[PDB]
Amino acid sequence: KDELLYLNKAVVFGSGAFGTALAMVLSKKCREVCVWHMNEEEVRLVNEKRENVLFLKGVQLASNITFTSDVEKAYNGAEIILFVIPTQFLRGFFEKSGGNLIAYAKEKQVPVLVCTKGIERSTLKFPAEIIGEFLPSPLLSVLAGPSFAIEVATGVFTCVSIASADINVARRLQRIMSTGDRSFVCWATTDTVGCEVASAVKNVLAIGSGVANGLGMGLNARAALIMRGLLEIRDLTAALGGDGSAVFGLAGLGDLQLTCSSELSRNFTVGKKLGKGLPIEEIQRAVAEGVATADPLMRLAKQLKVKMPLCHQIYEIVYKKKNPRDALADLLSCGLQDEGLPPLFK
Amino acid sequence: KDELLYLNKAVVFGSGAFGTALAMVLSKKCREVCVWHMNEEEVRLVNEKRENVLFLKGVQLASNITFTSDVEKAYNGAEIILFVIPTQFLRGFFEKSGGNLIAYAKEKQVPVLVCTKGIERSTLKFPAEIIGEFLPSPLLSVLAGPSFAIEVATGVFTCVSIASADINVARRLQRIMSTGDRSFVCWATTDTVGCEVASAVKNVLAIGSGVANGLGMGLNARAALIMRGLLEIRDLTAALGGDGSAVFGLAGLGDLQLTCSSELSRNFTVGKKLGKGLPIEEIQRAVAEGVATADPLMRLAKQLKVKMPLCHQIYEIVYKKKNPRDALADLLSCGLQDEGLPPLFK
Ligand SMILES: CCCCCCCCCCCCCCC
Ligand SMILES: CCCCCCCCCCCCCCC
Ligand SMILES: Fc1nc(Cl)c2nc[nH]c2n1
Ligand SMILES: Fc1nc(Cl)c2nc[nH]c2n1
Numbered sequence: 001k002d003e004l005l006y007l008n009k010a011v012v013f014g015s016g017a018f019g020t021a022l023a024m025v026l027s028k029k030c031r032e033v034c035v036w037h038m039n040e041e042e043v044r045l046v047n048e049k050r051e052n053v054l055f056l057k058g059v060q061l062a063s064n065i066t067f068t069s070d071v072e073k074a075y076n077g078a079e080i081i082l083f084v085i086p087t088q089f090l091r092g093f094f095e096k097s098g099g100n101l102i103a104y105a106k107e108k109q110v111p112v113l114v115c116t117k118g119i120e121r122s123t124l125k126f127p128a129e130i131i132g133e134f135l136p137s138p139l140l141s142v143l144a145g146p147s148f149a150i151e152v153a154t155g156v157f158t159c160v161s162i163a164s165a166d167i168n169v170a171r172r173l174q175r176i177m178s179t180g181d182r183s184f185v186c187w188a189t190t191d192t193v194g195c196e197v198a199s200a201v202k203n204v205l206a207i208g209s210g211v212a213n214g215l216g217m218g219l220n221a222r223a224a225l226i227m228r229g230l231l232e233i234r235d236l237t238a239a240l241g242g243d244g245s246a247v248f249g250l251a252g253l254g255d256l257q258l259t260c261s262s263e264l265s266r267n268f269t270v271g272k273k274l275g276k277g278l279p280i281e282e283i284q285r286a287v288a289e290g291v292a293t294a295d296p297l298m299r300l301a302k303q304l305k306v307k308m309p310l311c312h313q314i315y316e317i318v319y320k321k322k323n324p325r326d327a328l329a330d331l332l333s334c335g336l337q338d339e340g341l342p343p344l345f346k
Numbered sequence: 347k348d349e350l351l352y353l354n355k356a357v358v359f360g361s362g363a364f365g366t367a368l369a370m371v372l373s374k375k376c377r378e379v380c381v382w383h384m385n386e387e388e389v390r391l392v393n394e395k396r397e398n399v400l401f402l403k404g405v406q407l408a409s410n411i412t413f414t415s416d417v418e419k420a421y422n423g424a425e426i427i428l429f430v431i432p433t434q435f436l437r438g439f440f441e442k443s444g445g446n447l448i449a450y451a452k453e454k455q456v457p458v459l460v461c462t463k464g465i466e467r468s469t470l471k472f473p474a475e476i477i478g479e480f481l482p483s484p485l486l487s488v489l490a491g492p493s494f495a496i497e498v499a500t501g502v503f504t505c506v507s508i509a510s511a512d513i514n515v516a517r518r519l520q521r522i523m524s525t526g527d528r529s530f531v532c533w534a535t536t537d538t539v540g541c542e543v544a545s546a547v548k549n550v551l552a553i554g555s556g557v558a559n560g561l562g563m564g565l566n567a568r569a570a571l572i573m574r575g576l577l578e579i580r581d582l583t584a585a586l587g588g589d590g591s592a593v594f595g596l597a598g599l600g601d602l603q604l605t606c607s608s609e610l611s612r613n614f615t616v617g618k619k620l621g622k623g624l625p626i627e628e629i630q631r632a633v634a635e636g637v638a639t640a641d642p643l644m645r646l647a648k649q650l651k652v653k654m655p656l657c658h659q660i661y662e663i664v665y666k667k668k669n670p671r672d673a674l675a676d677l678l679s680c681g682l683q684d685e686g687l688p689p690l691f692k
Contacts (some may be wrong), residue, residue, distance in 0.1 A: 002681025087370050146569030157563045159570035161685050174682050184680045187685040217503045219604055223492030226507035227600040234690065244690030248594050257603045258565055314597040327667025332528045336520050339533040344580065344590030 010198035014084025021153035040069040080201035087118030144251035148259035193242025207290035209260040210271020232308040235276035360430025369497035373408035388413040406611035433464030463545035472542035490597035490606035539588025555606040556617020
């Protein structure tokens with residue numbers, strides 16, 4: 001059924017740019033939308049100026065969006081729950097404040113949409129997997145795709161995929177998240193692993209994109225990094241048991257090419273400074289997702305015996321003061337090779 | 347063998363930007379490089395100013411690159427032949443001036459590299475297929491990948507794929523085209539059809555990218571157009587008997603994302619003006635490859651019963667004065683769907 005679903009209430013845990021942007025999306029499909037933010041003082045401010053001046057300045061929030069520091073009131077009555085809490089705080093949130101939330105979600109069978117991205121350092125697990133330790137899979141879906149927050153928040157045409165092991169679960173969330181004016185369109189897929197992998201790895205690759213630019217390279221190089229980088233996402237996805245159908249879709253190449261072409265992003269800028277010879281210490285003044293993700297990514301890759309040429313070199317440049325130019329030469333020391341892509345048709 | 351091959355002579359038929367750029371690449375692997383250009387008066391000019399002021403202004407040609415209007419002297423002694431002659435002139439060139447050239451190529455078993463891109467209107471065939479009517483396949487390879495001419499001509503890091511039904515043929519051309527400083531790296535593949543399809547369709551899609559921009563959309567939209575557009579390249583490739591291994595590689599998504607992000611390209615500008623409501627007649631002052639390719643592409647698609655949503659709508663906007671906004675709505679009238687990508691791993 002391509003018929004949309006409207007709800008009475010939606011709750012979004014995570015007040016970042018993406019989370020706020022998604023709250024704007026939901027304000028067009030849900031009579032009420034609550035956005036949980038821990039700092040009460042800042043919550044009042046946001047509700048007063050009707051604008052998330054903290055992480056989405058310049059965008060006026062719909063009048064039916066209300067920020068709150070009260071976890072209980074936040075999810076109370078919600079018919080869909082979105083998690084956009086940073087990876088490092090995810091587990092702690094559930095242990096310290098998710099008790100009743102979890103019970104409610106299970107009791108009322110409320111759909112949960114995972115929008116958090118990254119890799120937990122202690123377990124090398126992805127967001128949806130972490131959340132899966134507290135909530136059952138039947139209620140878990142992941143949202144991923146080329147979706148700059150500003151564009152999503154202001155209703156500029158955007159496409160994303162919704163992933164769930166059970167495609168029917170994804171299709172229902174697809175009916176909830178897709179907007180009436182077709183400005184936010186969702187596509188269903190089963191590849192939850194591919195989505196989480198791509199969402200994490202793209203940030204590391206984006207730093208490599210920055211490096212290439214700071215190294216004097218142009219757009220041909222960026223296109224090659226994206227194409228060869230996507231294969232690393234594919235290989236890691238396979239090793240993690242993912243079906244891989246999201247790799248060459250919106251969450252995979254779609255989001256990857258977008259993220260690697262965002263020259264003003266912190267991942268890019270950090271990479272550019274690294275390509276220009278600046279030491280990481282000096283650059284650190286700004287925590288780019290790519291920097292934080294590179295270590296656990298490398299450890300997970302090693303643990304699974306997955307070779308990730310680009311990501312490995314990016315880790316060396318960022319963590320082992322490796323000279324960008326030398327890293328590049330090492331990458332190319334492999335010699336002439338075949339593109340390494342299987343045929344699609346026999 | 348990852349060991350490079352150097353030659354005494356190389357000839358490039360086609361003096362355009364890409365052809366000249368490739369001549370620069372060859373000047374680093376071939377003692378002598380001839381570039382055929384029909385107009386003798388212009389040939390003398392280029393050789394005097396040692397610069398292709400006609401299609402690659404600003405780039406000084408290597409001293410071992412010589413332009414010429416003499417087809418015979420051009421290929422005489424060449425150990426590799428590149429064709430970059432525009433599609434519409436390809437067949438006529440072989441009929442009127444390729445007689446001895448063809449004989450020589452067959453006699454000496456000289457490798458031929460097809461760099462021309464497009465669709466011949468009269469036969470709806472691709473460049474390598476057209477050339478295949480005069481020369482045997484064993485000697486035919488195709489070059490495709492994200493490769494802006496200026497960057498290639500000046501040695502800025504670039505990656506491309508070399509396609510040949512017989513992978514061993516591609517691997518040898520890969521040893522010839524790849525440069526000693528690893529600034530131009532070639533990857534071998536068998537998907538000649540996918541490469542030719544992607545190279546032609548990308549220009550039509552680039553116009554759609556322009557439309558999206560002139561329509562007020564942002565980068566999320568562009569990323570979605572690239573991802574969904576790639577599927578049209580895939581489907582058409584399948585229908586033409588291609589193995590498809592190039593679709594998600596350098597010649598496919600690599601070149602596509604690059605071509606769709608070139609905001610200053612004619613395909614983009616034409617698309618932008620169309621998205622802004624300007625009639626094609628008014629815009630035409632500049633023949634964008636996308637405009638010329640859209641008609642034969644649509645006719646070939648219809649002939650093979652291949653649905654190409656984006657390319658079809660772009661054809662309507664360009665040839666049938668269809669309102670960009672209406673085209674967009676028609677594209678989205680399909681309703682909620684699954685992403686439609688098969689799993690890569692079982
Ligand atoms: C980290 C610097 C940016 C690199 C520029 C892109 C180069 C892409 C080529 C990758 C080839 C990898 C060889 C496979 C082992
Ligand atoms: C031609 C205008 C540009 C369109 C902007 C990109 C939209 C991509 C969505 C395509 C969906 C196609 C539905 C499949 C039939
Ligand atoms: F952001 C953010 N979110 C949550 Cl949930 C937190 N818990 C402790 N610090 C935290 N910071
Ligand atoms: F460009 C270009 N190339 C060739 Cl080969 C031609 N033959 C006739 N006009 C032509 N224009």
